[PDB]
Amino acid sequence: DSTECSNLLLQYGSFCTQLNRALTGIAVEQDKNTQEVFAQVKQIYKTPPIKDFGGFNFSQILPDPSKPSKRSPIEDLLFNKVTNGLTVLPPLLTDEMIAQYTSALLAGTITSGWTFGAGPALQIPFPMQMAYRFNGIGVTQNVLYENQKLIANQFNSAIGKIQDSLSSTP
Amino acid sequence: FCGKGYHLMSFPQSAPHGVVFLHVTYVPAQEKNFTTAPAICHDGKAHFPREGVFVSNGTHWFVTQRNFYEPQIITTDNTFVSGNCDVVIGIVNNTVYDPLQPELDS
Amino acid sequence: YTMSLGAENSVAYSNNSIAIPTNFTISVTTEILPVSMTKTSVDCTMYICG
Numbered sequence: 054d055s056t057e058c059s060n061l062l063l064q065y066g067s068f069c070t071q072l073n074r075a076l077t078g079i080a081v082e083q084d085k086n087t088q089e090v091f092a093q094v095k096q097i098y099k100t101p102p103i104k105d106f107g108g109f110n111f112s113q114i115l116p117d118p119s120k121p122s123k124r125s126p127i128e129d130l131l132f133n134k135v136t137n138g139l140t141v142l143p144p145l146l147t148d149e150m151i152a153q154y155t156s157a158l159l160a161g162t163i164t165s166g167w168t169f170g171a172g173p174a175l176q177i178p179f180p181m182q183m184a185y186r187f188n189g190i191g192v193t194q195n196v197l198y199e200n201q202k203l204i205a206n207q208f209n210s211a212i213g214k215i216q217d218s219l220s221s222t223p
Numbered sequence: 224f225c226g227k228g229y230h231l232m233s234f235p236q237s238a239p240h241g242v243v244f245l246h247v248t249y250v251p252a253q254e255k256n257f258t259t260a261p262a263i264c265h266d267g268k269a270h271f272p273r274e275g276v277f278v279s280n281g282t283h284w285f286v287t288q289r290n291f292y293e294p295q296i297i298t299t300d301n302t303f304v305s306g307n308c309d310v311v312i313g314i315v316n317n318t319v320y321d322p323l324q325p326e327l328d329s
Numbered sequence: 330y331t332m333s334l335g336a337e338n339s340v341a342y343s344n345n346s347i348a349i350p351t352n353f354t355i356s357v358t359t360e361i362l363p364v365s366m367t368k369t370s371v372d373c374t375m376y377i378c379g
């Protein structure tokens with residue numbers, strides 16, 4: 054609040070304008086980064102009420118209805134595990150909207166595969182989508198269909214191990 | 224990476240201190256519902272599509288390519304056999320045509 | 330206002346239904362990427378001292 058200090062500071066020119074402009078550029082760049090990462094779909098996809106995906110369980114990654122924040126258990130664990138003229142500007146996208154974007158991406162990739170990323174979301178059964186992914190890596194569809202229960206059990210076990218590993222590693 | 228949609232090609236254009244890429248992509252449109260099955264049960268054998276997918280318009284079963292609707296008769300030339308019908312969940316019963324059958328029939 | 334992320338689109342998922350495209354659109358999109366800047370040189374002695 055010193056007037057004499059500001060009068061002497063004016064002798065140095067537009068240094069303050071340069072610093073404010075650089076900080077403003079960084080601040081808008083962070084919002085641009087968040088838009089580029091999370092806002093890649095213009096449709097908010099939602100999962101069907103019946104979670105019949107041929108044995109595949111997505112409860113640990115889909116949003117929890119019981120939580121007011123509408124986050125997944127994994128996302129909730131992630132949020133729990135992260136702890137003089139200065140101002141902190143809030144991010145343009147809040148945490149619930151970022152969670153909504155991730156939920157839309159999850160719903161699109163579960164119900165439609167990769168179709169929603171290239172155009173209109175085309176529905177496909179999830180085992181058939183997994184079979185398409187199997188064909189992408191050079192494994193025949195029959196292998197997926199014959200061992201579908203085993204593949205679903207392995208996927209659920211791996212997702213649970215991911216949650217346990219995140220909860221058990223500082 | 225090269226535009227929204229399935230990338231077909233791209234064209235470069237010079238710009239002042241920059242480049243403009245015109246990405247030509249293929250976008251699916253006018254989609255239609257069909258009833259689908261993982262495999263076709265015929266003669267106690269399970270048939271799977273070689274490159275396409277089994278679709279049904281309500282009464283008849285066909286095999287088509289995944290990115291464009293082009294229904295074709297389910298034959299032995301576009302399907303492959305792996306195992307019986309007891310293992311695959313959701314297998315449906317439909318006939319599988321044999322192109323060689325009229326040749327020895329005549 | 331509170332911004333809207335996108336229009337809601339509930340995909341009609343079921344265990345035995347697929348959506349197959351019957352047509353296509355050849356879509357051309359633009360992507361602008363900067364390549365170079367203006368090449369500026371400053372004579373340090375002449376700038377500071379003339």
Ligand SMILES: *[C@@H]1O[C@H](CO)[C@@H](O[C@@H]2O[C@H](CO)[C@@H](O)[C@H](O)[C@H]2NC(C)=O)[C@H](O)[C@H]1NC(C)=O
Pocket residue numbers: 104110111112
């Ligand atoms: C999907 O997985 C979730 C969690 O892995 C299962 O929910 C569990 O259900 C059992 C039995 O009802 C409960 O004892 C557990 O406490 C539940 N866990 C959680 C985290 O809620 C769920 O049953 C699985 N299957 C389906 C169809 O959702």
Ligand SMILES: *[C@@H]1O[C@H](CO)[C@@H](O[C@@H]2O[C@H](CO)[C@@H](O)[C@H](O)[C@H]2NC(C)=O)[C@H](O)[C@H]1NC(C)=O
Pocket residue numbers: 280281282283
């Ligand atoms: C599903 O498609 C098949 C073949 O495109 C349809 O079968 C044809 O139906 C027309 C109209 O009755 C007949 O004139 C043709 O002779 C049929 N072709 C064959 C090979 O049978 C079938 O009707 C379609 N089903 C529905 C519900 O649209």
Ligand SMILES: *[C@@H]1O[C@H](CO)[C@@H](O[C@@H]2O[C@H](CO)[C@@H](O)[C@H](O)[C@H]2NC(C)=O)[C@H](O)[C@H]1NC(C)=O
Pocket residue numbers: 264316
């Ligand atoms: C598809 O065809 C198979 C074989 O023809 C059917 O399986 C038969 O089902 C009847 C009804 O219970 C049994 O009596 C036979 O013994 C079964 N045969 C075999 C080889 O398993 C099957 O039910 C048919 N499915 C549909 C939907 O028509």
Ligand SMILES: *[C@@H]1O[C@H](CO)[C@@H](O[C@@H]2O[C@H](CO)[C@@H](O)[C@H](O)[C@H]2NC(C)=O)[C@H](O)[C@H]1NC(C)=O
Pocket residue numbers: 254255256339340341342348
């Ligand atoms: C495929 O069938 C589903 C279910 O019959 C259609 O989904 C419905 O479409 C109507 C049309 O506007 C909506 O009002 C309903 O809310 C939709 N239901 C669900 C659960 O999404 C779907 O539109 C059909 N797709 C095509 C291409 O015909």
Ligand SMILES: *[C@@H]1O[C@H](CO)[C@@H](O[C@@H]2O[C@H](CO)[C@@H](O)[C@H](O)[C@H]2NC(C)=O)[C@H](O)[C@H]1NC(C)=O
Pocket residue numbers: 253351352353
């Ligand atoms: C696929 O969509 C194209 C549009 O790109 C359709 O082409 C149009 O067809 C109508 C009627 O024949 C014409 O009046 C339009 O001028 C055509 N548009 C263009 C850009 O040529 C095409 O007919 C559609 N095909 C199917 C099978 O639905």
Ligand SMILES: *[C@@H]1O[C@H](CO)[C@@H](O)[C@H](O)[C@H]1NC(C)=O
Pocket residue numbers: 105312313314344345
């Ligand atoms: C789809 O689920 C229904 C029960 O909702 C079941 O009767 C039917 O057999 C299932 N179809 C496939 C292909 O899994």
